[PDB]
Design a protein around this ligand. Structure first.
Ligand SMILES: CCCCCCCCCCCCCCCCCC(=O)OC[C@H](COP(=O)([O-])OCC(O)COP(=O)([O-])OC[C@@H](COC(=O)CCCCCCCCCCCCCCCCC)OC(=O)CCCCCCCCCCCCCCCCC)OC(=O)CCCCCCCCCCCCCCCCC
Ligand SMILES: CCCCCCCCCCCCCCCCCC(=O)OC[C@H](COP(=O)([O-])OCC[N+](C)(C)C)OC(=O)CCCCCCCCCCCCCCCCC
Ligand SMILES: CCCCCCCCCCCCCCCCCC(=O)OC[C@H](COP(=O)([O-])OCC[N+](C)(C)C)OC(=O)CCCCCCCCCCCCCCCCC
Ligand SMILES: CCCCCCCCCCCCCCCCCC(=O)OC[C@H](COP(=O)([O-])OCC[N+](C)(C)C)OC(=O)CCCCCCCCCCCCCCCCC
Ligand SMILES: CCCCCCCCCCCCCCCCCC(=O)OC[C@H](COP(=O)(O)OCCN)OC(=O)CCCCCCCCCCCCCCCCC
Ligand SMILES: CCCCCCCCCCCCCCCCCC(=O)OC[C@H](COP(=O)(O)OCCN)OC(=O)CCCCCCCCCCCCCCCCC
Ligand SMILES: CCCCCCCCCCCCCCCCCC(=O)OC[C@H](COP(=O)(O)OCCN)OC(=O)CCCCCCCCCCCCCCCCC
Ligand code: SF4
Ligand code: SF4
Ligand code: SF4
Lengths: 185, 67, 56, 75, 153, 166, 334, 85, 85
């Protein structure tokens, strides 16, 4: 229990004190018991909080704070020209801790290395950002969006069409979040 | 939790019609400067003297407001 | 019985019945009865055999 | 659905008559079970199981009760 | 017709106004779910009261990983919920298995066990994301036709 | 028992910070409540020291064979791009062997036992959860006592069942 | 008299009963908002303007929810307990004076009427736990019945001390007799004990094992769905308001303050309301402030602390009354 | 018709309405040996001491509404009665 | 600051007591003939009200007349009942 060597100085407690030896007067002792002084003090604390401002925000009219690093709904991004950023490296499919990404690829009609299938199973994804960290072209990113609850589970099986549409809609946020945090990446 | 002086002031700055409409959706008496409007018609406001995280808020264009 | 006593003007004793007999004696009876193991089958006497004596 | 209607009262006088020129479970390779095989399964959750309702204790049961204390006097 | 919509509005307003979930807080999603009752979001301000037993509850929030060993218990409490009732699947694990989809001991989505009305994504969904899903279910109740459904047939 | 893993086997920067270890004497739920309340104050005391002692420099070990290179390096020079590619597809190789490593987690001694086979995947990962040992003692601490005290000791053990079951 | 007696009784009953239920509904809304302000939060603010429709949403939701009764033990017995609890919880409002004699029944035995109807309400709780056919929930309802009868002894012992001062069981006479002084000053320990007993009598925190779900064996009220929950909850809020009204009647001077009939009546009603509302606030205040007492400790508090003090006060007080020639007259006066 | 009789009827009527609503408009579906153990004697004691002490308080209530005529002599007997219990 | 919205239900509760007090005072006063009612009515009080009715017709009626009208000596009500004696 104690470390090896001599006992720590004053580790042994002094002997217990009898009722007779208690250094506290009877009137104080009887008064606290019958008047419940510490319970009254605790109640007084609540009144102090009763007149302090509440912390509540009125969601969805107000929102809590999120950072440029926030990991939400996935999106596929473009270049300013509109070409897809994705070149089917499969780095995000390999690093994915949950095996949520499935990719197929060949040469496009113009001979470019592009995907034919890019699915993310949002009911397998653990929202960790590893794909976004592994992507060498900033193709896969997590948007700040978190309000996309769905009626059916099939609506959470994102294919390439769903993900490229998400990137088209969210691009100004995606660029702003990349703009703020890229120095730290 | 508005407090009397806050709600009385915002009432004077907004009027009773606006006050009651605001009481019908957000359930508070809020007043601030119009920051802008989005494509859907939502109006966004700022007031830096509000409580933390309550300094920005949206008035939704649609009755069935959704986030 | 308590309601009967109240309506004829015996208000104190009628309320005493409510407080004492229903309020405490009956509560004690149900506590003990509802804690003990009872098989209703073990408690059924053939009441038809007691009907002629019941009339007499 | 009240389980009760004009055409339902009329329906209870009628008696199921089985067409003899119609395919049966035989044709499908099936052998229907009798309803009395299924009442206990489907109605078991509707039989009372309160302690009040067990049949009286056997003499075997009466004797073993005397091996236990039936009230906690220390509690 | 107008009368039956009025009762429809009235009965739906009550279902939305007193939204009482039975939080089956299986794992870490229950922490985000527990943060909806705290001062910042104060679900009670909207009428949400968490209930311990399924008997008093209208909605089941499956917030956590459902193991095979636990599934019979989840089915049992769902069966003990009075109608009208709803189920919200919250989190990747409850939705489709999540990080443990390939585990020998995990149900690959609670919709294998109970029917689900709303799926909330995230591992974990934020407290606001959970609130968004509850809003969707309230909008679902608000559009539920009850007296007009019987009136159609 | 005066024992803290941060004191007995220091890790990270706990040897560079000052803090006290609350210790009870009656081994009951009240002593354990008072130790945890004082741990609040020592945690805040450590955080203030970390704010002032925070040094400058990198936050990731500077070998791109173990940690991923900065994104600007990965898009700029050949060596960084290769190391980025390999770390996110194969992963870094860990020298073979085994170790039991423990820390003073908020719920007690958390340990992990890892066996490495030399490859990029661990051969064996076993997690020592303090809540597992604590709940295994529930019978020992509760036998002979009142049912109305069980909620007190379930709460006195810091019990999260993701720890217990894993 | 001037108009029909039946019309008068209709109107008098409607004036007491209907606004009472409105007040009971908003005590539940006020409980949520008071604990919220104390908890740095808002409480109901969305169901109706300022959350003023929250209790009506709750009641309608539960009244349209499906009930899940026991395994067909009995239809009558299952509802019998809830019905008894609600009816007798509300019956005590009929002797409350909203002004001198301004009660549904201006009864000379009124104090004993209030005690009787409270004793008949404990039956519903006990008859519910048994009817649930669950030996786990029966023990909790049994413990709740033991707590209710034990603290009924605390309340009727405290009330006996007030009757010694006023010499009457008429609630009106008790109030009139406080124009001399509110009984909270001469009977200050009794008022504190009576308020504590009223909290325990209502299964309210810190005496709230009946609804406690975190305690392993507690939570008897927690298995009550739909209509049965409405019955039990309405009965409890109804008793909370009535224990606050009776506390104001006995110790805070009732309807007394600190020419037209309408305004005199309004002021008497308002003064009783202000005093009742303050005790409702304190009632909410203690639930938010304290942890929960164990069943064995709360029974020991009643039988080894409160009752021994009260029986000591039962000796002292009449001795003081005799020694100062202040034994009151028991005839109709005031 | 006495205000107390109408009050009792109305309170009963409220209870029936609440039952009626949930019986008529709420949904209804057919959603519907035992071990034994000794019980705790403390439950019998709580009821026993409550009842016996409830009777003694009842017996003192006449004194509180008769203190003036009872005066000193009736107070002695009340004090004797209180001392014994 | 002061959270007024939390205090609104208390204002409703306080106002409900006032409504009952004002309403009960008004209807009782109209019932009594536009005069304040009686309370703590004992047997002497009830008898005096019956004697007031057999002078004026109204249980609350007053007259300062030193001489009773003719037929007063004949209108003392003997009450009849069938069972409870
Ligand atoms: C006891 C000590 C409690 C803890 C200590 C409190 C403390 O020091 O906080 C200081 C705190 C620090 O100042 P601050 O937070 O910066 O506030 C500055 C704002 O500018 C202030 O803005 P403001 O609008 O809040 O100004 C307040 C002003 C304006 O406020 C008002 O006039 C509202 C009060 C009257 C209306 C209330 C009824 C509303 C509903 C009406 C009916 C509706 C239905 C019909 O009224 C006052 O001057 C003070 C009156 C306080 C009354 C509190 C209400 C009762 C609370 C307890 C209820 C218990 C029974 C229920 O001061 C306050 O919070 C303001 C109130 C002062 C404390 C009053 C404590 C009274 C307690 C009585 C019990
Ligand atoms: C005791 C038994 C339980 C209580 C029963 C009576 C409860 C008190 C009256 C409550 C009436 C329902 C609430 C008022 C109507 C309403 O919902 O307004 C919002 C409704 C809409 O409700 P909503 O649910 O669609 O709005 C949603 C609000 N958010 C976005 C916050 C979720 O307004 C309408 O557009 C339709 C109005 C229909 C006509 C008004 C009906 C009044 C009926 C009064 C009956 C009185 C008896
Ligand atoms: C006012 C209350 C009375 C309204 C008039 C009667 C109700 C409408 C007429 C019959 C409609 C039947 C609809 C049945 C149905 O939809 O099934 C679902 C359910 C019934 O399900 P069910 O079909 O299984 O019912 C079973 C019937 N038993 C149990 C006997 C077998 O209906 C409801 O949920 C009720 C919705 C309407 C009632 C809402 C009352 C709220 C009143 C608040 C004040 C309103 C003031 C308005 C002014
Ligand atoms: C009932 C007994 C009332 C006794 C005195 C109550 C005083 C407080 C009245 C509160 C209700 C005021 C009206 C209201 O807010 O309804 C809003 C409702 C809407 O309810 P809501 O939930 O949609 O409110 C929306 C506003 N937010 C969400 C931001 C808070 O509007 C109506 O439809 C009112 C018409 C029907 C009113 C039925 C209830 C009337 C009760 C008083 C009569
Ligand atoms: C129940 C309601 C509450 C009743 C109790 C509240 C009143 C408490 C009165 C104070 C109690 C003790 C009074 C006293 O004289 O104490 C002195 C003596 C020991 O002296 P001490 O204080 O320990 O010396 C200093 C050491 N630091 O301590 C003693 O020897 C004990 C002496 C007790 C005498 C008590 C006399 C007052 C009784 C008040 C009854 C109130 C009745 C009205 C309610
Ligand atoms: C069955 C009801 C029996 C009648 C009880 C009753 O109405 O008496 C009222 C009584 C006090 O009223 P009182 O002024 O003494 O007499 C008025 C008589 N009309 O009231 C009482 O003394 C006791 C009232 C007890 C509860 C009566 C309702 C019982 C049924 C509730 C279900
Ligand atoms: C409205 C106006 C304000 C109302 C204020 C209400 C205050 C909050 C009331 C909440 C309920 C009361 C909580 C009581 C807590 C409790 O029961 O504590 C039990 C405690 C145990 O003490 P005991 O068993 O005697 O042994 C002590 C040695 N360790 O036993 C005790 O502590 C008893 C001490 C309290 C005695 C109070 C009664 C006497 C009142 C003055 C006389
Ligand atoms: S998203 Fe990025 S990492 Fe994944 S395949 Fe496309 S380019 Fe490679
Ligand atoms: S966030 Fe993580 S789990 Fe989800 S797809 Fe990207 S790598 Fe896979
Ligand atoms: S989805 Fe993620 S956060 Fe939610 S329970 Fe599963 S692992 Fe935990």
């Amino acid at each position: 229990a104690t470390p090896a060597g001599p006992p720590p100085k004053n580790f042994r407690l002094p002997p217990p004190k009898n009722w007779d030896e208690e250094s506290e007067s009877t009137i104080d002792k009887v008064g606290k018991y019958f008047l419940m002084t510490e319970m009254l003090r605790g109640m007084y604390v609540l009144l102090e909080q009763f007149f302090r401002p509440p912390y509540t925000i009125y969601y969805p009219f107000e929102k809590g704070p999120i950072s440029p690093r926030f990991r939400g709904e996935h999106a596929l991004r473009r270049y300013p020209s509109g070409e897809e950023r994705c070149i089917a490296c499969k780095l995000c499919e390999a690093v994915c801790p949950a095996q949520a990404i499935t990719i197929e690829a060949e040469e496009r009609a113009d001979g470019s290395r592009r995907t034919t299938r890019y699915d993310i199973d949002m009911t397998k994804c653990i929202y960790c950002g590893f794909c976004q960290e592994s992507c060498p072209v900033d193709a896969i990113v997590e948007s700040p969006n978190a309000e996309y609850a769905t009626e059916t589970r099939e609506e959470l099986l994102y294919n390439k069409e769903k993900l490229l549409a998400n990137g088209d809609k969210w691009e100004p946020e995606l660029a702003a979040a990349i703009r703020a945090d890229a120095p730290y990446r | 939790m508005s407090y009397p002086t806050r709600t009385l002031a915002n009432l004077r700055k907004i009027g009773l019609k606006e006050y009651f409409r605001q009481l019908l959706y957000i359930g508070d008496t809020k007043y601030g400067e119009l920051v802008g409007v989005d494509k859907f018609g939502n109006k966004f406001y700022e007031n830096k003297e509000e409580l933390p995280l309550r300094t920005r808020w949206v008035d939704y264009a649609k009755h069935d407001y959704d986030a | 019985v308590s309601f009967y006593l109240i309506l004829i003007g015996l208000n104190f004793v009628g309320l005493s019945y409510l407080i004492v007999y229903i309020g405490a004696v009956s509560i004690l009876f149900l506590f003990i009865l509802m804690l003990i193991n009872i098989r209703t089958s073990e408690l059924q006497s053939n009441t038809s055999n007691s009907i002629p004596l019941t009339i007499l | 659905d009240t389980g009760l209607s004009r055409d339902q009262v009329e329906r209870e006088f009628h008696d199921q008559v089985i067409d003899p020129t119609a395919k049966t479970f035989k044709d499908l390779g099936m052998e229907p079970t009798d309803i009395s095989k299924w009442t206990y399964h489907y109605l078991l959750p509707y039989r009372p199981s309160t302690y009040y309702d067990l049949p009286p204790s056997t003499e075997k049961e009466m004797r073993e009760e005397r091996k236990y204390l039936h009230v906690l006097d220390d509690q | 017709q107008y009368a039956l919509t009025t009762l429809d509005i009235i009965t739906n307003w009550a279902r939305q106004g007193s939204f009482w979930p039975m939080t089956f807080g299986l794992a870490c999603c229950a922490v985000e779910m527990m943060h909806l009752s705290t001062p910042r979001y104060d679900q009670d301000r909207l009428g949400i009261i968490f209930r311990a037993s399924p008997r008093q509850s209208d909605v089941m929030i499956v917030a956590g990983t459902l193991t095979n060993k636990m599934a019979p218990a989840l089915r049992q409490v769902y069966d003990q919920m009075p109608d009208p009732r709803w189920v919200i699947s919250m989190g990747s694990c409850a939705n489709g298995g999540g990080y443990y989809h390939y585990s020998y001991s995990v149900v690959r989505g609670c919709d294998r066990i109970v029917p689900v009305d709303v799926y909330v994504p995230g591992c974990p969904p934020t407290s606001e994301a959970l609130m968004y899903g509850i809003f969707q279910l309230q909008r679902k109740m608000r559009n539920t036709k009850i007296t007009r459904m019987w009136y159609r047939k | 028992v005066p024992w803290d893993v941060r004191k007995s086997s220091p890790y990270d920067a706990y040897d560079q910070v000052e803090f006290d270890v609350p210790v009870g004497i009656n081994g009951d739920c009240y002593d354990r409540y008072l130790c945890r309340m004082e741990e609040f104050r020592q945690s805040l005391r450590i955080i203030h020291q970390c704010l002032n002692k925070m040094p400058a420099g990198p936050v990731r070990y500077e070998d791109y064979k173990i940690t991923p290179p900065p994104r600007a390096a990965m898009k700029e020079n050949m060596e960084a791009l290769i190391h980025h590619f390999l770390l996110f597809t194969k992963g870094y190789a860990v020298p073979p062997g085994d170790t039991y490593t423990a820390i003073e987690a908020p719920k007690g001694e958390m340990g992990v036992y890892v066996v490495s086979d030399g490859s990029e995947r661990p051969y064996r990962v076993h997690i020592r959860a303090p809540g597992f040992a604590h709940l295994s003692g529930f019978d020992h601490i509760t036998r002979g006592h009142l049912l109305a005290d069980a909620v007190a000791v379930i709460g006195t053990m810091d019990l999260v069942f993701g720890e217990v079951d894993r | 008299m001037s108009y029909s007696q039946t019309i008068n009784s209709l109107v008098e009953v409607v004036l007491v009963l209907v606004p009472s239920l409105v007040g009971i509904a908003y005590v539940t809304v006020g409980e949520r908002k008071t604990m919220g302000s104390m908890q740095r939060r808002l409480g109901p603010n969305a169901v109706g303007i300022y959350g003023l429709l929250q209790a009506f949403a709750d009641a309608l939701k539960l009244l349209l929810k499906e009930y899940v009764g026991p395994t067909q033990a009995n239809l009558v017995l299952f509802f019998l307990g809830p019905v008894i609890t609600l009816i007798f919880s509300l019956l005590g409002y009929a002797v409350i004076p909203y002004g001198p004699g301004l009660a549904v029944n201006d009864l000379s035995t009124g104090i004993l009427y209030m005690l009787a109807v409270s004793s008949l309400a404990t039956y519903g709780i006990l008859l519910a736990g048994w009817s649930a056919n669950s030996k786990y929930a029966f023990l909790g309802s049994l413990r709740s019945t033991a707590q209710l009868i034990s603290y009924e002894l605390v309340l009727s012992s405290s009330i006996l001390l007030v009757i010694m001062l006023s010499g009457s069981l008429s609630l009106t006479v008790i109030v009139e007799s406080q124009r001399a002084i509110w009984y909270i000053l001469p009977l200050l320990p009794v008022f504190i004990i009576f308020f504590i007993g009223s909290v325990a009598e209502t299964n309210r925190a810190p005496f709230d094992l009946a609804e406690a779900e975190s305690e392993l064996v507690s939570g008897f009220m927690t298995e009550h769905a739909a209509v049965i929950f409405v019955f039990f909850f309405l009965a409890e809020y109804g008793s909370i308001v009535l224990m606050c009204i009776l506390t104001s009647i006995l110790f805070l001077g009732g309807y007394l303050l600190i020419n037209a009939p309408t305004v005199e009546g309004s002021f008497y009603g308002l003064s009783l309301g202000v005093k009742t509302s303050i005790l409702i606030f304190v009632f909410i205040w203690t639930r938010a402030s304290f942890p929960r007492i164990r069943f064995d400790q709360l029974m020991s508090f009643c039988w080894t602390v409160l009752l021994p003090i009260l029986f000591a006060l039962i000796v002292l007080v009449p001795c003081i009354l005799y020694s100062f020639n202040i034994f009151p007259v028991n005839i109709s006066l005031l | 018709m006495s205000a107390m009789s109408i009050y009792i009827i109305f309170v009963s009527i409220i209870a029936i309405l609440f039952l009626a609503i949930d019986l008529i408009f709420a949904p209804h579906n057919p959603y519907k040996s035992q071990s034994r153990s000794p019980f705790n004697i403390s439950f019998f004691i709580y009821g026993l001491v409550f009842l016996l002490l409830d009777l003694e308080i009842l017996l003192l209530y006449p004194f509180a509404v008769s203190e003036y005529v009872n005066s000193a002599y009736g107070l002695a007997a009340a004090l004797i009665f209180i001392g014994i219990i | 600051p002061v959270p007024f919205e939390t205090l609104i239900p208390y204002g409703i509760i306080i106002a409900m007591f006032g409504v009952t007090g004002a309403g009960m005072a008004k209807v009782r006063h109209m019932f009594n003939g536009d005069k304040r009612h009686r309370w703590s009515v004992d047997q002497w009080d009830k008898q005096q009200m019956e004697r007031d009715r057999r002078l004026t017709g109204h249980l609350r009626g007053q007259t300062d007349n030193p001489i009773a009208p003719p037929g007063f000596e004949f209108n003392n009500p003997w009450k009849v009942x069938x069972x409870x004696x």
